[PDB]
Design a protein around this nucleic acid. Structure first.
Ligand code: MG
Ligand code: MG
Ligand code: ZN
Lengths: 128, 203, 175
RNA sequence: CGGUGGAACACAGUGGAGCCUUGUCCUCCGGGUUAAUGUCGCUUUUGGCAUUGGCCCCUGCUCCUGAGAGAAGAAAUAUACUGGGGAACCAGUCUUUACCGACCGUUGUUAUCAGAAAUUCACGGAGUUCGGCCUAGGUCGGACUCCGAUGGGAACGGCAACGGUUGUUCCGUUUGACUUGUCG
RNA sequence: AGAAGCGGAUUUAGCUCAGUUGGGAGAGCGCCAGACUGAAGAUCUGGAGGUCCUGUGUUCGAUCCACAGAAUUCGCAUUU
């Protein structure tokens, strides 16, 4: 089919960008969890901001993420869904996950099992 | 009510930083009504007599370990700062600091055009385009502090894991870079006239 | 001509540790009692399935039960099968997450055997949530849950910086 | 960057030639009222649909031009939408007593991968309505609505170019005073 | 050291200059190195070498597109 070339020289600029993205994601997630465990929604517009900036940096250097991150974050307001509103299933569709802002992220689950994403398949992925 | 606030994240962030300043002013008024100078007694006084006012108050004692450890460990991983210091490379480190985001940094106003802005340490909750947002504690003050960047000099310490032997201190200038973090991810910084920096020689 | 290019993609650095399913051992001592009890429920009458032992086997009822509607029953136990094909991964990446924010003492048990496709093919979906309030079953459930089947969280408990994880995916590009 | 002193208030400043779709006193679409006709249900009569005819629907200000600045209570808290600013606000698309609103059409582009799909191609599932075989309501076709892991993404959304405006295009000046030469 | 006002063209590696559906940042010369020669030139191969004038904003992404701020340089029946 073609040529098989596997380079492990990672580039320094991409490592800087993905470390910046991962630091923004970690600080937003830890702010959200440290606020959520103790008491009510104090600075929930704060951490979301980081994610939005993160997504804008994901728009800059043409970078792509795993579907775990984009499944975690929202699409319109770009907030973390670690505490969502409601989870419904088999309500004449497949699945529904409601949020506080009203934007839902549904998944086709009533069709068939044993479906994996392209990054979750057996050999398509090499760690580090 | 809750849906109309978080429609835009910027406007809700502005509403939150206004609510923190209003709650800090109400805290100063209730503290002068309390006539107790101790802040640890003041927080319990607010918990006893003002439940709804206590809900939007910041927690700096919580804010320090949740930010400083992550920031220092991220810089120790990113700039390759290890036990072996004699293999360091400064130019690539300054390029990485030009590429790294300063959201969540501890930073100190060391020199400024205004004589009252200096001496302020604080941790970044958000980076604006031409201003700067930190948080600092006083005796009883817990106000979100906005500081201009046009004509100010900022500094931050990068510690090393050894105790009292060696540590690093770097400095940035907010009048030099005046953009969002999004543009700063892609921007290659270039030369300027730098004529308005006489204050850095003056004071 | 087709050429294969490896593209660097940022991983969720803690999803492996957030999906560290709990340590389970000496598990064939448990499926005997569990399967015998579930069959003895499912034989007689559909009302008598849930009348002496209250259990919910629909995920919408799991969310509505853990939302905060019923707060009396504090020890509530859950059984979820992993390492099993024909099981949806969309729910399975969110089942141990939703039980963490529940204020009730919810005890997740991960069943490790791959051949256990019986409970999915028989009851509803392959998961079981029930209450140990005054039932006889708790008289052994409290016995073994302290031994090997402990469920605790190390990842959110203490303050710790997490190292970054950048993986790389395959891409076939025709020219 | 602009325009004026050439145009005399649109008298397109005027004239001539060529071409055509031969310059249509035309038409905003659209919304409301009134009159007439035909069908369908209540039965002095009214209601709904379609056609035809008539009316009503908003130069923000100064200025020849270029341009300048004012306000968005006819649906909001941020005073139409979108992005930023630290806030007066700025930029772009717009509207201005709109007592009804109106983002013009065509062409191409959004590279590789991904995904069913990079432009209302198509495909898969659910619901409704109609027709044929048929009558425990099974199947087939057509129409509408909603959803489908991916990516900034499915949004008739973003970018670039061109015009139907009172037919297009070309050519010439309406700009001078003294000195000299010719002609009457 | 021969202004002032007007139109056109134009800035990319040290230099001279390309180039652009908008998705890679280049060629010649020069420098270094290899090859070659008794030695050198020429020829040939490879590497080093970037503020794409600067800034805003559009976009998912700018040498390119829009705006703003600088300028480079030619011509004005000339060789001063
Ligand atoms: Mg002048
Ligand atoms: Mg001038
Ligand atoms: Zn959301």
């Amino acid at each position: 089919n073609g040529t098989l070339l596997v380079p492990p020289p990672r580039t320094i600029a991409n490592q800087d960008h993905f470390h910046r993205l991962n630091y923004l994601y970690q600080i937003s997630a830890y702010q959200t969890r440290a606020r959520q465990k103790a008491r009510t929604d104090a600075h929930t517009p704060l951490a979301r901001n980081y994610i939005k900036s993160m997504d804008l940096i994901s728009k800059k250097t043409k970078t792509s993420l795993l579907p775990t991150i984009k499944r975690t974050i929202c699409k319109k307001c770009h907030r973390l869904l670690w505490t969502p509103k409601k989870l419904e299933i088999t309500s004449d569709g497949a699945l529904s996950v409601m949020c506080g802002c009203g934007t839902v992220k549904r998944f086709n689950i009533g069709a068939d099992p044993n479906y994996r994403t392209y990054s979750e398949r057996e050999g398509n992925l090499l760690n580090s | 009510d809750y849906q109309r606030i978080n429609k835009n994240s910027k406007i809700a962030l502005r509403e939150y930083i206004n609510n923190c300043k209003k709650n800090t002013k109400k805290c100063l008024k209730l503290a002068y009504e309390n006539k107790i100078t101790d802040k640890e007694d003041l927080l319990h006084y607010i918990e006893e007599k003002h439940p709804t006012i206590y809900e939007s108050l910041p927690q700096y004692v919580d804010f320090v370990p949740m930010y400083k450890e992550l920031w220092i460990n991220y810089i120790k991983e990113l700039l390759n700062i290890t036990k072996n210091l004699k293999t360091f490379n400064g130019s690539l480190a300054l390029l990485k600091l030009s590429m790294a985001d300063y959201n969540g940094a501890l930073l100190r106003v060391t020199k400024s055009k205004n004589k009252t802005l200096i001496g302020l340490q604080g941790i970044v909750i958000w980076d604006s385009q031409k201003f700067f947002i930190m948080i600092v504690k006083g005796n009883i003050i817990d106000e979100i502090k906005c500081i201009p960047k046009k004509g100010t000099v900022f500094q931050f310490e990068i510690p090393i894991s050894d105790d009292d032997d060696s540590a690093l201190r770097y400095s940035i200038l907010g009048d030099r870079f005046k953009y969002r973090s999004v543009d700063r991810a892609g921007r290659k910084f270039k030369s300027r006239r730098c004529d308005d920096m006489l204050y850095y020689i003056q004071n | 001509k087709r050429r294969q290019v490896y593209k660097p993609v940022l991983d969720n650095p803690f999803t492996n540790e957030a999906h560290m399913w709990p340590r389970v051992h000496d598990q064939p001592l448990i499926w005997q009692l569990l399967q015998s009890s579930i069959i003895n429920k499912l034989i007689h009458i559909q009302s008598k399935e849930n009348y002496p032992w209250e259990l919910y086997t629909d995920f919408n009822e799991i969310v509505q039960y853990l939302s905060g509607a019923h707060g009396n029953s504090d020890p509530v136990c859950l059984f979820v099968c992993n390492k099993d094909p024909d099981v949806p991964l969309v729910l399975l990446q969110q089942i141990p997450l939703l039980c963490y924010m529940a204020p009730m003492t919810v005890k997740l048990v991960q069943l490790p055997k791959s051949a256990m496709d019986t409970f999915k093919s028989v009851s509803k979906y392959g998961m079981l949530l029930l209450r140990c309030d005054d039932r006889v079953d708790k008289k052994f459930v409290s016995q073994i849950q302290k031994n090997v089947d402990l469920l605790q969280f190390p990842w959110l408990n203490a303050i710790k910086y997490r190292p970054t994880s950048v993986k790389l995916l395959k891409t076939t590009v025709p020219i």
